[PDB]
Ligand binder design. Structure first.
Ligand SMILES: C[C@@H](C(=O)O)c1n[nH]c2nc(N)[nH]c(=O)c2c1=O
Ligand SMILES: C[C@@H](C(=O)O)c1n[nH]c2nc(N)[nH]c(=O)c2c1=O
Lengths: 252, 252
């Protein structure tokens, strides 16, 4: 039981009633195609919209946040690691930050987070696979992200963790991170799991990307059962139903 | 780790390498439509074909077992509780018995099992929902099926258990049986979970029977993670992929 609510400016996310679904989002053609998708996702049971060099990243992602935040009543996270991109995106209307490098590629991003008082997702990442002991190094690695974030003024309650499935991990190390996901819980934070349609599901099932829906389901179910608060997925309709059935069962 | 193989006459089922999928099966039109389905199921990753008053039950189910056992190289279980039906069906070519009353409606069925030396599935069932303590009563109830079976000469290794999801249980008691499935393990037997498309998935998701595929997935994943050796499903293709992803993850 979490004794607090995820505070996202306009919207508030309760961490106890259900698994929160974060749906992944793909001029006028671009921004409209994006709005249709957010609306669809919003309608299929999504609770959050995730919207993915420096000059161009802003020119592409800012227009989308303006449009989607205006027409879809749901918190928006900006899928970046660059400090400037993150600032611009929160100004444009993004509620959450989602950094795939856990404040380590550009430490100043954390200072953006503390500044605007927004929730931040620190994902596990690194430039090698040379682990002593996978889980233990992960936990040490994520904790290093927490220290960078805390030193920057980010409040405990605006911190979210993500084990970084599919990053800096071999096919077999990804299964291992899955199998030991509950250990992440000892750190005392909400956990977002992002496994959708990823390579390692292909490697187990020997299936191409468009046929990984049942594989993704598996990983989502396993992760909810191991205590995750969020899941980041492509197939919002399917995964929402799966999440809700899980939640019924574990008694959430 | 099971230190023995499920022995089914012609075929042998290993209990350690993977989750075994049992696929549910629906004159010339009848028996041919049935054969197409078994073949399809066999091709989608099924490991076992499950084939569902006394006079007519034999006339309908015997022809199917003859045909399917001849054209599909996979063990067949007969989904009955009647003693005579079970005998006739094993003569017709059925390898396993699947009793939904756990030897309690017709105790003589167990004697059929001991006689032909075939594996038997004892499912939990009863004519009321008046539980003191759900799980505990289940375990006591199933154990009563084991005592009837053992007294009849059924060998420990030919015994399989099934918690009886959807039987004699309220919507909320079914979620509870799911949430506590691992307790069944203490009895020392293989466990078959059968939740496919059932009413309680409808009650949680508020979805009709043809839209319960993601709900069923959830229950299958939860059950594998809680140590089940079999799952009995309609949607063989989808559930096989889900099972295999689970198995990769739990390290099975
Ligand atoms: C790799 C990419 C993707 O959608 O596959 C991705 N981007 N951002 C991501 N952010 C987080 N927090 N987690 C992810 O798994 C993840 C991704 O998998
Ligand atoms: C009720 C029916 C069905 O397919 O839904 C059924 N028949 N036989 C069954 N046998 C076993 N061992 N388990 C079941 O859940 C089960 C069923 O659910």
């Amino acid at each position: 039981k979490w004794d607090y609510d995820l505070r996202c400016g306009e919207y508030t996310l309760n961490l106890n009633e259900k698994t929160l679904i974060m749906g992944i989002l793909n001029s006028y053609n671009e921004v409209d195609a994006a709005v249709r998708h957010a609306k669809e996702m919003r309608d299929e049971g999504a609770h959050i919209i995730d919207i993915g060099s420096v000059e161009e990243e802003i020119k592409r992602v800012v227009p989308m946040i303006q449009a989607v935040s205006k027409e879809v009543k749901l918190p928006i996270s900006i899928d970046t690691y660059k400090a400037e991109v993150a600032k611009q995106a929160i100004e444009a209307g993004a509620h959450i930050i989602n950094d795939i490098w856990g404040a380590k590629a550009e430490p100043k991003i954390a200072e953006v987070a503390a500044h605007y008082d927004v929730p931040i997702i620190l994902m596990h990442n690194r430039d090698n696979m040379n682990y002593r002991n996978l889980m233990a190094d992960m936990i040490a690695d994520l904790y290093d992200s927490i220290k960078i974030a805390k030193d920057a003024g980010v409040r405990d309650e605006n911190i979210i963790l993500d084990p970084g499935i599919g990053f800096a991990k071999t096919p077999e190390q990804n299964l291992e991170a899955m199998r030991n996901l509950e250990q992440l819980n000892v750190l005392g934070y909400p956990v977002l799991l992002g496994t959708s349609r990823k390579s390692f599901i292909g490697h187990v099932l020997d299936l191409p990307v468009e046929e990984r829906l049942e594989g993704t389901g598996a990983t989502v179910c396993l992760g909810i059962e191991k205590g995750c608060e969020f899941v980041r997925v492509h197939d919002v309709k399917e995964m929402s139903r799966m999440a809700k059935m899980m939640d019924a069962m574990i008694g959430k």
